[PDB]
Design a protein around this nucleic acid. Structure first.
Length: 491
DNA sequence: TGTCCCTTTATCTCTCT
DNA sequence: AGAGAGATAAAGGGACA
């Protein structure tokens, strides 16, 4: 027999029951736990399904799936029920914070290390709990917390970094690695190649920070002199997500992409300066000619699509969907290029293809409106949220379709829509804001927190802001959102 | 294996002027 | 409003007891 067969049966036997109360997963959630948490994790969720759900912890079935779907999930589940009260009463953290900490590989380690080092890290090191929680909310949070305790002094004193910078570096997977590598390489990178600490913090403050630092050190000379890249251009590549892989891939494919396709170095850097840059570059090398065939998408359009995170996914999805969307949906190549030219372009194109019919026929939008919603980062989310919420917003809340589309046509459009639908009645009914004003506020990136800031001030007012009228607060929130209100508060 | 740690890639959301 | 920045997730590999 295949030996993993008994272990697969256990999974299903137990998985079956979990669809019932008090959790009741939906296969998606169940599949997820199995893949990452594995068999012992699916069994642990079952075993502790009652202890977690209701009193005393009262975790939503959502948070339970978040804690369980990682390596050592079972251990995290046992530790949360043991340490969530300790952490929520002895340190003043919220359950949301405890869950965020639990929800990573080795979460048991992170929760225990937080319980053990938070006092020392706030008292003797002057860190907030927020910062402690942030450091702890990544795989190996335990290692990062311990490395922060050990190296905060030398990093601020001998090397001149602020605590904020140290926290920023530590708050990624492999935090301990990035920290140790910054200690050794900060003088080397600053004094030998003339980088500022700030640039060095930016290179270190991503997952694989250690790898990006050492790769900058190694390849900077070769990049700046052989290829004519500026130091500034190298940093941009190393600090934007491609990291080590994008750097190594720039050295390889800069000449190839320039000579053979007439791309400028400026355009190549922009493709590389994203998450999965390596992947975007190699995909462009392969795909540019296929896309710009028979007068197809121009080079410039191909670069534009490529120059976003997951740009590889975007390029491939265009090649697949450019014909079907242009023909069977009546979209100009220009419109398809628009929707694909953002982070998650693949997701948006796919969602346009799926919902463009439904949004026009069932909700009476134009293609141009569906394109506008989709043509932002997270466009898939904005599209799905418009489909769900268009009726309750228009019918129950009074908004026009044009207004609902307006709120949706920005990064975070989904957050902006859910938050409007949530807070419109108290904003209008309880504090006298007009709908048009609420729509104005939420029709910008950062729509959600701007609206939350406003409601927070109208319901537990700060004297710091009381000299301002409702109309002023609105004018301010449209101008600069939560940041503009936070600033004014500090004055 | 189960658990812990690290690295790359993709997606989503908010900031900054 | 595009560019910059940063949180969160999925998925794979090393390591080890």
């Amino acid at each position: 027999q295949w030996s993993g067969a008994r272990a697969l049966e256990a999974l299903l036997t137990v998985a079956g029951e979990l669809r019932g109360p008090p959790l009741q997963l939906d296969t998606g959630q169940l599949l997820k736990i199995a893949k990452r948490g594995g068999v012992t994790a699916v069994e642990a969720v079952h075993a502790w399904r009652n202890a977690l759900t209701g009193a005393p912890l009262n975790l939503t079935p959502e948070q339970v799936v978040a804690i369980a779907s990682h390596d050592g999930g079972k251990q995290a589940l046992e530790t949360v029920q043991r340490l969530l009260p300790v952490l929520c009463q002895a340190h003043g953290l919220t359950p949301q914070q405890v869950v965020a900490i639990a929800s990573h590989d080795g979460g048991k380690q992170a929760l225990e290390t937080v319980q053990r080092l938070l006092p020392v890290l706030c008292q003797a090191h002057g860190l907030t709990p927020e910062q402690v929680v942030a450091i702890a909310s990544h795989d190996g949070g335990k290692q990062a917390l311990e490395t922060v305790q050990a190296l905060l002094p030398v990093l601020c004193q001998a090397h001149g970094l602020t605590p904020e910078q140290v926290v920023a570096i530590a708050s990624n997977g492999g935090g301990k690695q990035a920290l140790e590598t910054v200690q050794r390489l900060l003088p080397v990178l600053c004094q030998a190649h003339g980088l500022t600490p700030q640039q060095v913090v930016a290179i270190a403050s991503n997952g694989g920070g250690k790898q990006a630092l050492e790769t900058v050190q190694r390849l900077l000379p070769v990049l700046c002199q052989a290829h004519g890249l500026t130091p500034q251009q190298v940093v941009a590549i190393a600090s934007n997500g491609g990291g080590k892989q994008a750097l190594e891939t720039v050295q390889r494919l800069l000449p190839v992409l320039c000579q053979a396709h007439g791309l400028t170095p400026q355009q190549v850097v922009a493709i590389a300066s994203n998450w999965g840059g390596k992947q975007a570059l190699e995909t462009v090398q392969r795909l540019l000619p296929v896309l710009c065939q028979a007068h197809g998408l121009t080079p410039q359009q191909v670069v534009a699509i490529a120059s976003n995170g997951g740009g590889k996914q975007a390029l491939e999805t265009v090649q697949r969907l450019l014909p079907v969307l242009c023909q069977a949906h009546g979209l100009t190549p220009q419109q398809v290029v628009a929707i694909a030219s953002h982070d998650g372009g693949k997701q948006a194109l796919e969602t346009v293809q799926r919902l463009l019919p439904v949004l026009c026929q069932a909700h009476g939008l134009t293609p141009e409106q569906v394109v506008a919603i989709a043509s932002n980062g997270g466009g898939k989310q904005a599209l799905e949220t418009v489909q769900r919420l268009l009726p309750v917003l228009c019918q129950a809340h009074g908004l026009t379709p044009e207004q609902v589309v307006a709120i949706a046509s920005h990064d975070g459009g989904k957050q902006a829509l859910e938050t409007v639908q949530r807070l419109l009645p108290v904003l209008c009914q309880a504090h006298g804001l007009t709908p048009q004003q609420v729509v104005a506020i939420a029709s910008n990136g950062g729509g959600r927190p701007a609206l939350e800031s406003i409601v927070a001030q109208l319901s537990r007012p700060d004297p710091a802001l009381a000299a301002l009228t409702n109309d002023h607060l609105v004018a301010l929130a449209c101008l600069g959102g939560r940041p503009a209100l936070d600033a004014v508060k500090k004055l």
